[PDB]
Amino acid sequence: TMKVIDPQHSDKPNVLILGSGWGAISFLKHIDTKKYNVSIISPRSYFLFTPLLPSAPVGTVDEKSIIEPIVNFALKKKGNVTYYEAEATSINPDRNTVTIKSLSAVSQLYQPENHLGLHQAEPAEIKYDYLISAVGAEPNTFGIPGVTDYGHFLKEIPNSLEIRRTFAANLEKANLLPKGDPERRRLLSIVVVGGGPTGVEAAGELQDYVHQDLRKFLPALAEEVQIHLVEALPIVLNMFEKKLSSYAQSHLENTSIKVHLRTAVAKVEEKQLLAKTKHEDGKITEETIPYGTLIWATGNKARPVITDLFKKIPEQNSSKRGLAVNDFLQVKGSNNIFAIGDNAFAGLPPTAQVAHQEAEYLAKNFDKMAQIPNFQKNLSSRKDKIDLLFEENNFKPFKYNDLGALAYLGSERAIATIRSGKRTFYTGGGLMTFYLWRILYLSMILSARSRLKVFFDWIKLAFFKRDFFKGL
Amino acid sequence: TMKVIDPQHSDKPNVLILGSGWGAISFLKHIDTKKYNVSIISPRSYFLFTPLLPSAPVGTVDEKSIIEPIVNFALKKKGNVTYYEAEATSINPDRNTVTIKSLSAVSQLYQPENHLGLHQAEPAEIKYDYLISAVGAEPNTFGIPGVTDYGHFLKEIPNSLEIRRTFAANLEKANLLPKGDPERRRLLSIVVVGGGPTGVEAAGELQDYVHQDLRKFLPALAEEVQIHLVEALPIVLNMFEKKLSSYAQSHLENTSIKVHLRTAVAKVEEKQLLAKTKHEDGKITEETIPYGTLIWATGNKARPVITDLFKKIPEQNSSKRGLAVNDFLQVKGSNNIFAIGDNAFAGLPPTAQVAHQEAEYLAKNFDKMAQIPNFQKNLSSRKDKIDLLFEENNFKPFKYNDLGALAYLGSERAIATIRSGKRTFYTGGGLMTFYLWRILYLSMILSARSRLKVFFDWIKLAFFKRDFFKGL
Ligand SMILES: Cc1cc2nc3c(=O)[nH]c(=O)nc-3n(C[C@H](O)[C@H](O)[C@H](O)COP(=O)(O)OP(=O)(O)OC[C@H]3O[C@@H](n4cnc5c(N)ncnc54)[C@H](O)[C@@H]3O)c2cc1C
Ligand SMILES: Cc1cc2nc3c(=O)[nH]c(=O)nc-3n(C[C@H](O)[C@H](O)[C@H](O)COP(=O)(O)OP(=O)(O)OC[C@H]3O[C@@H](n4cnc5c(N)ncnc54)[C@H](O)[C@@H]3O)c2cc1C
Ligand SMILES: NC(=O)C1=CN([C@@H]2O[C@H](COP(=O)(O)OP(=O)(O)OC[C@H]3O[C@@H](n4cnc5c(N)ncnc54)[C@H](O)[C@@H]3O)[C@@H](O)[C@H]2O)C=CC1
Ligand SMILES: NC(=O)C1=CN([C@@H]2O[C@H](COP(=O)(O)OP(=O)(O)OC[C@H]3O[C@@H](n4cnc5c(N)ncnc54)[C@H](O)[C@@H]3O)[C@@H](O)[C@H]2O)C=CC1
Ligand SMILES: [Mg+2]
Ligand SMILES: [Mg+2]
């Protein structure tokens, strides 16, 4: 009753990739398609360059500029790549299969295709020799009531649209109200929850729009908007040196953002939220904050398809943040499942930088496995010896090299620490750091198209106001 | 019970503009805001550069590139401009008022604003000294059944989005079906009704996408798409010389578009439509054409707010296509209403070219009226003498100067006839004509921002495939 897709007209092993983000796409770019048959399953038909996402809701860059269709990467590959636009709902380790639903499309980027006989919204299972799981993670509310109903995450392209639509609508209503009206004040207030670089960059970009663009035509309205950054810890950007945090904070306050440190949002309602401050002496105070737009940026948690998999594998039952993997990024308790990026946990920070390095490491290992006939064989055997094969052939374990971190702060200021190994090549903040931020980001974009478009967005920004359309 | 906005803290006359299109915006650009107070009512907060609309559904240019916010033009003005984002529902000539509904926003681009006390979705009446009606026209179905339910117009930005979403969705379903499936064939078929430059350019742009971009990754699918152009007359592009029509048609057919001349769509159903051919000898044949995407481009008709006004003015009861105006673009039967663009009819073709010339002419006349105290006065008087005042001060009547016409045909070919007076400076077709088409269109764009963005779209097109996202 359940269709099974199992391509056996090739001697090449079938590598199945879950996702189309940093892990999946970086892997796709490096994997040898002459040696392997690659399929990809993802509900999102494009790669998202997440570091510029915070700059999309206000039109600093356009949404289209920071995404790139999977097919464009796949076209660069010499062999057979297939992309299933669908969601993996169940990983089935013992039969080597992935169950997919919400299938919208299947693209076989190779001349003599085989008709698969799939139908939209018809469930199916896709058979693999090797599985690479990179479905990332999903926004964490920490069980705080109301965040899902009344706030916006900042995680995917639709969030950027949603945020713009909410704020634009609020600006229109507010401007019809007389100055000093408390409801007007509420509609013009934005709360960003989470003082990591995502929340900070989101807050800075909104303040940029308000101060540079909105001010040009509705200056009274612009002057009344109030952005709040709410952070539970005693400092923002706690992954940087404290002096950079301290710079960032003063800068944000200087651009008129209100920064609430040692403060947690305890509850969210439709038009107000409850924030609690734990002061340095142990005393707790409370504040009710009326808000028009709520952006929630407090980190992520494992997706259901992954938590479900925790249960199916004895070695993973104690897993919580993500799949536990060995030195070779092999899922523990599994012979042929690998996991990279945010859906795997090995103590490293959940960043694009880690995902990208994992992917490139994993793809090199696949180059080597293709030179050792035995890896091919153990798939057929009933004994799982692949982890043994790694040590026995002296594959080096994955070693992460932290290259540093960057954060834009609004008003043409950024902080940046650039590293490699024990060496620091750059660490500071300011105007020049902002130009460095731009240049480095441009460098890290995965495609020429997206790189050109972001570059064009920035040039237009030199001369003209940001596009800020409610329905576009 | 109905609020009335009536600004009388100035001695300047209140000029009210309906629309934000070719007529309205061109007028706005030339009207003297030192002599007049200008308000604008339009449900669309941006100007649309219509000649590039056919090239938006497939991402040849982006939707954002060809629109420009009204506020951007208004900011260039020295005096007081106010923009009501709302729809005029009733023109009330005897009380000099316009009734508005669906109010979303009001923007007063001047420092000391007066709180108007308006509310969203609260009806209001806006009082004028002078009314300039430029609300354009709306798509005509000629009463053919089903066109509204099952087809798409190509008239406004949302149409471009709808068309993209339909075709993209069809491409996905079709590709899941085996080659030769008749349903697959249907899903890959597009019918464009109307052989004017709008239908032709739409067809050519779609064929461009299919041949240049889709073919790169799904060549089997691309090869099966079939675009149909259906035109009731015996030639396409009948406003051009027959030899250019003849060149266009051969070119279209050469790019694989099927052109059905002497053929009219008589009925439209969800998955098929009925087309009837009246042959040169008088014989009528019929064909049922299955289709996946239907684009309906057969010209326009008067909007309800305008037809309603026909009834309120004795001199306009016989009006059908639009408001009847005199030599000075004054609505007949009215002392202080003027009409330009497609909502007025004076025998001239309904084009942007005519609308733009009318607007600039009308604005010059307003410069002159401001030097003749009497125009100001007749507003107060009960006798309507403004039309007399025009002749008596020897204002010249409006004289249209046809500058020619242009049409893109797909695959880097265009036709173009450039005129002025009796002189023809250019008339022909081909590759160079296509480069001319681009350069002239860039020249005609009303703002630097939009012009830069279109220019960047074309450059990116030189290197990369068109963006064709279903949900963006
Ligand atoms: C706003 C923002 C800014 C960021 N900035 C930085 C930064 O500046 N520097 C940095 O180092 N990191 C940054 N990050 C973090 C970085 O984006 C993540 O660590 C990175 O995405 C992890 O890569 P991933 O492949 O594991 O997940 P992702 O890149 O999120 O990709 C996951 C993929 O899986 C797909 N998927 C989801 N569910 C399923 C399913 N059930 N079946 C199949 N596929 C599925 C998704 O659609 C997506 O295609 C930022 C994150 C955000 C949200
Ligand atoms: C796809 C396409 C391509 C075209 N290409 C060309 C070309 O290449 N060359 C050429 O010369 N002409 C071209 N035209 C024709 C040209 O666009 C029209 O003749 C022109 O729009 C007429 O100008 P207008 O101001 O009367 O109407 P529009 O420019 O359409 O403006 C009407 C305005 O009124 C607003 N409005 C609608 N209803 C109301 C309401 N009730 N109250 C207040 N405002 C309202 C609309 O939102 C819009 O802003 C093209 C048209 C289309 C659709
Ligand atoms: N923008 C960027 O450059 C980067 C962003 N990231 C993102 O950061 C995440 C990893 O860091 P995390 O610490 O998980 O998130 P984070 O780094 O975005 O910071 C979240 C912050 O929100 C605060 N917070 C949590 N609950 C709160 C509440 N109820 N009220 C107020 N504040 C609250 C926490 O103190 C925490 O510091 C990843 O999921 C990734 O998406 C990761 C790398 C880089
Ligand atoms: N794209 C461009 O360059 C320009 C386009 N226009 C548009 O042209 C319109 C004015 O010219 P029109 O002749 O009214 O429209 P049109 O010039 O766009 O062409 C419509 C054509 O469709 C055909 N048609 C009508 N009903 C049909 C049916 N049931 N089946 C098949 N064919 C049918 C007609 O013969 C007509 O030639 C305006 O609405 C304006 O928007 C105007 C100026 C320039
Ligand atoms: Mg398995
Ligand atoms: Mg939501």
Ligand SMILES: [Mg+2]
């Ligand atoms: Mg809200």
Ligand SMILES: [Mg+2]
């Ligand atoms: Mg006045």
Ligand SMILES: [Mg+2]
């Ligand atoms: Mg329709």
Ligand SMILES: [Mg+2]
């Ligand atoms: Mg064809």
